[PDB]
Amino acid sequence: EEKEILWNEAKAFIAACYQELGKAAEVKDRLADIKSEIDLTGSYVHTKEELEHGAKMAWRNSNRCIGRLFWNSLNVIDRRDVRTKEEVRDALFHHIETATNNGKIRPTITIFPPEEKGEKQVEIWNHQLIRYAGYESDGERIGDPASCSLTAACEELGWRGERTDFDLLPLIFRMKGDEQPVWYELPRSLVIEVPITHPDIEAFSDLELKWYGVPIISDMKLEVGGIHYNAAPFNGWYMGTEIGARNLADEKRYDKLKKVASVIGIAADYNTDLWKDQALVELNKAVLHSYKKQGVSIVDHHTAASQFKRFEEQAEEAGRKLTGDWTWLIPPISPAATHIFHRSYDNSIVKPNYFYQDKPYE
Amino acid sequence: EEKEILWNEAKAFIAACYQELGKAAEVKDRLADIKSEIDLTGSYVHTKEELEHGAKMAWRNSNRCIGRLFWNSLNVIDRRDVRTKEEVRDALFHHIETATNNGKIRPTITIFPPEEKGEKQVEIWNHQLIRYAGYESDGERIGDPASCSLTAACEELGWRGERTDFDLLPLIFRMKGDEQPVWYELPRSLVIEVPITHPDIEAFSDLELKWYGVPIISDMKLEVGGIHYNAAPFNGWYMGTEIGARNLADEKRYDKLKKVASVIGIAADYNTDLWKDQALVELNKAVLHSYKKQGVSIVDHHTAASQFKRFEEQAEEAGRKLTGDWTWLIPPISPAATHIFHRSYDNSIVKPNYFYQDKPYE
Ligand code: HEM
Ligand code: HEM
Ligand SMILES: Cc1cc(N)nc2ccccc12
Ligand SMILES: Cc1cc(N)nc2ccccc12
Ligand SMILES: [Cl-]
Ligand SMILES: [Cl-]
């Protein structure tokens, strides 16, 4: 019966993929080969072309992503050959280096062996490959609160953070057959970080804020034609509001707006002064400025929405249904200044796609 | 069969209303009276207490409204007695005066006779009782584009606007039995307007922006216990972003952001400068300042969201289900700085409520 589901997903994916690739005449025999492989083995193996286009389709179908215009240029690295924890570690180090690309960020996904019978071959514990630790005890909060549970799990396993506000968490993953994950410290030479300065407020550097260059989301599952790649980290470049309006601003994250207000010289006493909004704008201007000055790729939300409008236009031209989640596509700064706010989107889920999975810690 | 629907809606409303009013022991006989009235006449007439609490419940159930904390203090004016166009006009003038209250705005609804057999007794054409005209011809746009279709209908009927950017539209409504609506110019003494100035940027007044004090929405239908009050204008005070982030900012409205940027002394050339966001913040600060300086009620979005959190808390305490439309409840400026952004809401429709109806023009 799982075989049935697999076969059905296979037919739908192969037909669609090969049609997009101009390969429709090859579908019948490919499906023939797949049906026979499923019978014999219980699964099937994607060709490199299928795997690459499948990862691209999955990005294209990511309803919550404003950056999808560039779906067809995703760099897909096939690591279905890895078998040891050293190979996984080195593949993850390599992903960081090649995605970072000296600041000219390349959207990249590295795909590890898929689940066999729901059995994971490799399980990555990190939420992103580069992320800051968080701590809380005796009233004192340090670092990124969103990382508290993973930080605690790492310290259970013998890692120890320096307890700065920006400790890099180690890579942490578990191999099939092992009871516990292993962890590895990130080599600092691989990780670009950007200090946050403001284009004309010199005191802004007094906040000593920084953020890392590349968001490499490492805990979602890529599903393609019924095959479940639970370990498949992928990255883009940031949209500036992710850092300036959320990671550094949210009260349950770094909670910096009152400090921002103070350094930009405005009172934070009266809601009617809109000091939180003003602080948000200056913090978000600083974030874009800083990434730009350092030569690290980033996009602002206006430009990102303009690209997304082109994505919508391209879908229509290609004759493809567009899907989207309006509640995630609008930016958290001036959303009504974007065309996204003023239209609606069909939030239907289409596969291939990326999916949430349960955290093995917590 | 319409009688059936009416009766069913009646039972549900009367039971709920009387339970909230501590009057549960009176339901059985009231329902008895109503059932007999529906049989004889095809309809039923609300008591003044039912009508008032029904209008309040309808506000309470307005999923898209952030201002609902104050639902129970709505001022309900019962004008089911009007029969002539002069009485309607004078009732609308009176609503403006009493709602405005010299700037200390009173949330008010005036309820006119309901539809009889789907037959409207009074049909108000205005979108709001106070609203600016809009014009477009030979490439030239003047006033509020959102008012273009109603403005054209009024000028078909012999009204003529001065073609400033802020012409007040006349009241315009139609009485049962008349083929055409009538219109009446608004007495300027009844209409408070606020010039927009900025707390510390003196040049802001060069934009010569203003807005009217009181939003009095006049084209929705109030439904209570199966009775359809299609003519029932109601108002609150503004949340500042309605004016500063939408009415004065949207490209399809007054489209003022480039002008705002220029007067606040920033370039409007590069998306990465976030000049639209900065302009939005300063325009929204100016709007709040100006209403406050003039003694006209207004609320900022942070304070409004804080009140709405209390509304949520009160619903839970009362044991009432909360409903909401997240896509309208978030403010269009810094939405993630409000608790609304970080939770979800059940968008179910509960009656009594306010509903859209077709425009008799266009
Ligand atoms: C190239 C630059 C990229 C930009 C600027 C971008 C931008 C974003 C933004 C702003 C979000 C919303 C996150 C939030 O508001 O919390 C998001 C979500 C997402 N993006 Fe993209 N993205 C890019 C590339 C990618 C790539 C390469 C993939 C996959 C191959 C991807 C898959 C997704 C997914 C799956 C989500 C939703 C995550 C969730 O549900 O939690 N994105 N993106
Ligand atoms: C007392 C101050 C009030 C404030 C500050 C307030 C605030 C707002 C805001 C900001 C919206 C969203 C409009 C938009 O984003 O386009 C709204 C929608 C709404 N409000 Fe309120 N409101 C108030 C009073 C009232 C009253 C007294 C009623 C009815 C008795 C009411 C019924 C509604 C309805 C029905 C909507 C949705 C309109 C639609 O679907 O187009 N509000 N309110
Ligand atoms: C791949 C990616 C890029 C980005 N700028 N933001 C993301 C947020 C969530 C998941 C993936 C994301
Ligand atoms: C009654 C009311 C008040 C307000 N500030 N805004 C509204 C927007 C739409 C409908 C009614 C509204
Ligand atoms: Cl992030
Ligand atoms: Cl309005």
| Three state DSSP letters for chain A | CHHHHHHHHHHHHHHHHHHHCCCHHHHHHHHHHHHHHHHHHCCCCCCHHHHHHHHHHHHHCCCCCCCHHHHHHCEEEECCCCCCHHHHHHHHHHHHHHHHHHHCCCCEEEECCCCCCCCCCEEECCCECCCECEEEECCEEEECHHHHHHHHHHHHCCCCCCCCCCCECCEEEEECCCCCCEEECCCHHHCCEEECCCCCCHHHHHHCCEEECCCEECCCEEEECCEEECCCCEECCEEHHHHHHHHCCCCCCCCCHHHHHHHHCCCCCCHHHCHHHHHHHHHHHHHHHHHHHHCCCEECHHHHHHHHHHHHHHHHHHCCCCCCCHHHHCCCCCHHHCHHHHCCCCCCCCCCEEECCCCCCC
The answer to whether B199 touches B331, Cβ cutoff 8 Å, is no
Q: Which residues of B18-33 are buried (b: 16+ CB within 10 A; e: fewer)?
A: beeeeeeeebeebbee
Tell me the catalytic residues of A. Answer: 65, 68, 237, 242
- Interface contact A327-B332, CB threshold 8 A: no
Interface residues of A toward B, Cβ cutoff 8 Å, are 245-246, 249-250, 257, 271-274, 276-278, 280-281, 284-285, 288-289, 292, 300, 302-303, 306, 326-327, 330, 332-337, 341
Of the candidates B253, B221, B257, the residue with the CA atom closest to the CA atom of residue B147: B253
Instruction: Indicate the residue among A268, A286, A303 that finishes a domain.
Output: A303
- Give resolution in angstroms: 1.8
Domain-located, residue B334: no
Q: Which domain holds residue A34?
A: 1-80+107-117+221-235+305-329
Domain-located, residue B299: yes
Domain-located, residue A349: no
Which tokens in the block code for residue B316? 């839970």
**Same structural domain, B94 and B186:** yes
Which tokens in the block code for residue B48? 């003044």
Q: Does any ligand 3 atom lie closer than 6 A to the CB of residue A18?
A: no
Rounded Cα gap, residues B172 and B150, in angstroms: 9
**Whole-Å CA distances, B306 to A59, A331, B299, B338:** 37, 22, 11, 8
- In chain B, what is the straight-line distance between the N-terminal and C-terminal CA atoms, in Å? 32
**Same structural domain, A66 and A143:** no
**Same structural domain, B309 and B255:** no
Distance (angstroms) between ligand 4 centre and the Cα of B9 equals 26
Of A272, A292, A334, the CB nearest to B277: A334
Which residues of chain A are within 8 Å of residue B304 when distances are taken between CB atoms? none
Closest residue CA from atom 7 of ligand 4: B215
Of the candidates A288, A100, A261, the residue with the CA atom closest to the CA atom of residue B271: A288
Domain-located, residue B39: yes
Fill in the amino acid letter for B104: K
Residue A17 marked ligand-binding? no
Pairing mode, strands B234-235 and B216-217 = antiparallel
**Whole-Å CA distances, B286 to A266, A272, B102, B326:** 16, 10, 21, 27
Rounded Cα gap, residues B183 and B91, in angstroms: 14
**Whole-Å CA distances, A236 to A157, A202, A309, B262:** 30, 30, 18, 35
Rounded Cα gap, residues A212 and B128, in angstroms: 50
Domain count, chain B: 3
Distance (angstroms) between ligand 4 centre and the Cα of B237 equals 8
What B185-192 contacts at long range (C-beta under 8 Å, 24+ apart), as own/partner pairs, is: B185/B159, B186/B96, B186/B130, B187/B93, B190/B93, B190/B96, B190/B97, B190/B100, B191/B96, B191/B130, B192/B100, B192/B103, B192/B294, B192/B296
Domain-located, residue A294: yes
| The residue count for chain A | 362
Q: How many CB atoms lie within 10 A of CB A264?
A: 18
Mapped to the 3 state alphabet, what secondary structure does chain B carry? CHHHHHHHHHHHHHHHHHHHCCCHHHHHHHHHHHHHHHHHHCCCCCCHHHHHHHHHHHHHCCCCCCCHHHHHHCEEEECCCCCCHHHHHHHHHHHHHHHHHHHCCCCEEEECCCCCCCCCCEEECCCECCCECEEEECCEEEECHHHHHHHHHHHHCCCCCCCCCCCECCEEEEECCCCCCEEECCCHHHCCEEECCCCCCHHHHHHCCEEECCCEECCCEEEECCEEECCCCEECCEEHHHHHHHHCCCCCCCCCHHHHHHHHCCCCCCHHHCHHHHHHHHHHHHHHHHHHHHCCCEECHHHHHHHHHHHHHHHHHHCCCCCCCHHHHCCCCCHHHCHHHHCCCCCCCCCCEEECCCCCCC
Q: How many CB atoms lie within 10 A of CB A39?
A: 10
Task: Tell how far CA A4 is from the center of its chain.
Answer: 31
Q: Look at the block and give the residue holding tokens 């809009």.
A: B134
Rounded Cα gap, residues A358 and B208, in angstroms: 56
Domain-located, residue B177: yes
Rounded Cα gap, residues B105 and B85, in angstroms: 26
Of the candidates B13, B28, B66, B9, the residue with the CA atom closest to the CA atom of residue B238: B66
Rounded Cα gap, residues B266 and B271, in angstroms: 12
Q: Give the CATH number for residue A164.
A: 3.90.440.10
Q: Look at the block and give the residue holding tokens 């002064």.
A: A273
Q: Which residues of A302-329 are buried (b: 16+ CB within 10 A; e: fewer)?
A: bbbbeebeebbebbeeeeeebbbebeeb
- Interface contact A300-B337, CB threshold 8 A: no
Of A257, A280, A336, the CB nearest to B332: A336
B240 CB-contact burial (10 Å; exposed 0-12 / middle 13-18 / buried 19+): buried
Pairing mode, strands B182-184 and A134-137 = unpaired
**Same structural domain, A94 and A56:** no
Give every CB contact of residue A96 below 8 A, 6+ residues apart in sequence: A129, A130, A186, A190, A191, A214, A216
- Interface contact A300-B326, CB threshold 8 A: no
The answer to whether B230 touches B117, Cβ cutoff 8 Å, is no
Q: What is the dihedral of CA B125, B128, B130, B131, to 10 degrees?
A: -90
**Same structural domain, A29 and A127:** no
Rounded Cα gap, residues A163 and B79, in angstroms: 68
- In chain A, what is the straight-line distance between the N-terminal and C-terminal CA atoms, in Å? 32
* Inter-chain contacts counted by CB atoms under 8 A, chains A and B: 89
Of the candidates B51, B142, B333, the residue with the CA atom closest to the CA atom of residue A335: B333
**Same structural domain, B161 and B258:** no
A309 dihedral zone (left: phi>0; alpha: psi -120 to 50; beta): alpha
Beta bridge partners of B183: B172
Q: Look at the block and give the residue holding tokens 């580069």.
A: A130
Q: Does any ligand 2 atom lie closer than 6 A to the CB of residue B254?
A: no
Distance (angstroms) between ligand 3 centre and the Cα of A244 equals 14
Which tokens in the block code for residue B145? 């584009």
Which residues of chain B are within 8 Å of residue A333 when distances are taken between CB atoms? 274, 277, 334
**Same structural domain, B93 and B56:** no
Q: Does any ligand 2 atom lie closer than 6 A to the CB of residue B233?
A: no
B170 CB-contact burial (10 Å; exposed 0-12 / middle 13-18 / buried 19+): middle
- Interface contact B276-A302, CB threshold 8 A: yes
**Same structural domain, B96 and B179:** yes
Task: Tell how far CA A18 is from the center of its chain.
Answer: 27
Beta bridge partners of B195: B210
Rounded Cα gap, residues A47 and A76, in angstroms: 13
The answer to whether A176 touches A119, Cβ cutoff 8 Å, is yes
Q: How many CB atoms lie within 10 A of CB A180?
A: 10
**Same structural domain, A36 and A72:** yes
Ligand 3 pocket mutation pick from A217, A303, A325, A353 by most atoms within 8 angstroms of CB: A217
Question: Per the omega criterion (within 30 degrees of 0), is the bond before A215 cis?
Answer: no
A17 CB-contact burial (10 Å; exposed 0-12 / middle 13-18 / buried 19+): buried
**Same structural domain, A76 and A87:** no
Domain-located, residue B345: no
Tell me the catalytic residues of B. Answer: 65, 68, 237, 242
Of A250, A281, A327, the CB nearest to B277: A281
Rounded Cα gap, residues B301 and B330, in angstroms: 9
Rounded Cα gap, residues B246 and B256, in angstroms: 10
Annotated binding site of B for heme: 65
**Same structural domain, A6 and A31:** yes
**Same structural domain, A160 and A67:** no
Question: Per the omega criterion (within 30 degrees of 0), is the bond before B332 cis?
Answer: no
**What is the arrangement of strands in the sheet containing B171-175, beginning at the earlier edge strand?**
B122-124, B171-175, B182-184
Q: Give the CATH number for residue B298.
A: 3.90.1230.10
Question: How large is the angle between the packed helices A48-60 and A2-20, nearest 10 degrees?
Answer: 90
Q: Does any ligand 3 atom lie closer than 6 A to the CB of residue A234?
A: yes
Domain-located, residue B26: yes
Fill in the amino acid letter for A212: Y
Of B300, B326, B335, the CB nearest to A272: B300
Task: Tell how far CA B326 is from the center of its chain.
Answer: 18
Q: What is the dihedral of CA B62, B63, B65, B71, to 10 degrees?
A: 40
The answer to whether B263 touches B273, Cβ cutoff 8 Å, is no
Of the candidates A283, A267, A284, the residue with the CA atom closest to the CA atom of residue A275: A267
Rounded Cα gap, residues B146 and B359, in angstroms: 13
The answer to whether B86 touches B202, Cβ cutoff 8 Å, is no
Q: Give the CATH number for residue B51.
A: 3.90.340.10
Which tokens in the block code for residue B198? 């900025």
Which tokens in the block code for residue A144? 């990124």
**Considering only alpha carbons, which residue of chain B is nearest residue A257?**
B337
